[PDB]
């Protein structure tokens, strides 16, 4: 048994329809390997300033005969600084027709995120702490764990196919892998973190130069661009011809000529030999103003986001603590087998 779920290419992130409650209230929520909690926008939520947080569906707990209030406060803050707060609850969650009962979720009543988020990472990365660092509620079975426990999938694992930059939709498959959608063989890479879905990136090849790395990179579906440590990003930037711009008090972004030559590729080599080749088109991010961001940015965190992941077929295995990777093959052909 596998469960395929369509991913809507929404621009900065990828979202899916998921229903919640006895009355199956449909939500459109970001599919996020970079977080571990599923939360929905309450119908009576107050959105953050200038945020249209209710336009992708909302959840009315009082409409669901099966909703259970856990009474514990929920709070989460994401890498980009956006936040959500509400209360923990449990309800039935249905994903492409497959229902799991008593699934712990957060009913969010204030958020600066545009829509709900289905976090599908490790349970150890659940946002169960107050903003004092104190744990306020126990770690729990998140959606992938519950799919496994309730016999919907065999292994806590899922395959990610974001599809092409111009594609309308991709696919995530819980408990399965589509063998038609990559070239060569999947190569298993060791997850190197207790909390994050990170693997060892050995080197990056850009403009025919090799740049040795060797540290972990988070493979995050819920991050738009690619982020490297400042020093490493600067080496790549110099080669790429990107220029650093302070855009705010404590934020620096690389920009690049909108007309830069994007005919080449950037190659990512991983510890166990996985190899992903990314077209350089992925490193010119159109802003609205006739300026372009470079697709690589400096950060204390190393994150390979959507502009990388579109070019890989990835099988995340949270039981084995491996992520198996091969060069994507864009095709509607399908040959899915259970994992």
């Amino acid at each position: 048994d596998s469960i395929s779920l369509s991913l809507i290419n929404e621009g900065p992130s990828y979202a899916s329809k998921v229903s919640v409650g006895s009355n199956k209230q449909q939500q459109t929520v970001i599919i996020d390997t970079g977080s571990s909690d599923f939360w929905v926008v309450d119908s009576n939520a107050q959105c953050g300033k200038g945020v249209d947080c209710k336009s992708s569906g909302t959840f009315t707990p009082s409409s669901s005969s099966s909703y259970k209030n856990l009474g514990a406060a929920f709070t989460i803050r994401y890498g980009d600084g956006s936040t959500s707060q509400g209360t923990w609850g449990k309800d039935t969650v249905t994903i492409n027709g497959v229902s799991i009962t008593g699934q712990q979720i957060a009913d969010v009543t204030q958020t600066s995120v545009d829509q709900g988020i289905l976090g599908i990472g490790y349970t150890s990365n659940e946002a169960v702490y107050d903003t004092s660092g104190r744990q306020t509620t126990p770690n729990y079975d998140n959606v992938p764990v519950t799919l496994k426990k309730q016999g919907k999938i065999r292994t806590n694992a899922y395959s990610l196919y974001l599809n092409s930059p111009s594609a309308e939709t991709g696919t995530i498959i819980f408990g399965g892998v589509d063998n038609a959608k990559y070239s060569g063989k999947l190569v298993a890479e060791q997850v190197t973190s207790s909390q994050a879905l990170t693997i060892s990136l050995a080197s990056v090849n850009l403009k025919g130069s090799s740049f040795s790395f060797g540290d972990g990179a988070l493979l995050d579906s819920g991050t738009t661009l690619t982020y490297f440590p400042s020093d490493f990003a600067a080496q790549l930037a110099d080669k790429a011809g990107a220029r650093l711009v302070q855009v705010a008090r404590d934020q620096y972004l690389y920009f690049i000529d909108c007309n830069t030559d994007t005919s080449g590729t950037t190659v990512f080599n991983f510890g166990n030999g996985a190899k992903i080749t990314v077209p350089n088109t992925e490193y010119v991010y159109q802003n609205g103003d006739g300026t372009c961001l470079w697709g690589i940015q400096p950060s204390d965190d190393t994150i390979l986001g959507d502009n990388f992941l579109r070019h890989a077929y990835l099988l995340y295995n949270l039981d084995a603590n491996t992520i198996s990777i091969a060069q994507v093959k864009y095709t509607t052909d399908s040959s899915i087998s259970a994992v």
Binding site: S35, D37, G79
Partner: peptide
């Protein structure tokens, strides 16, 4: 863009 829990 966004960067999703670090």
């Amino acid at each position: 863009x966004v960067v999703x829990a670090x």
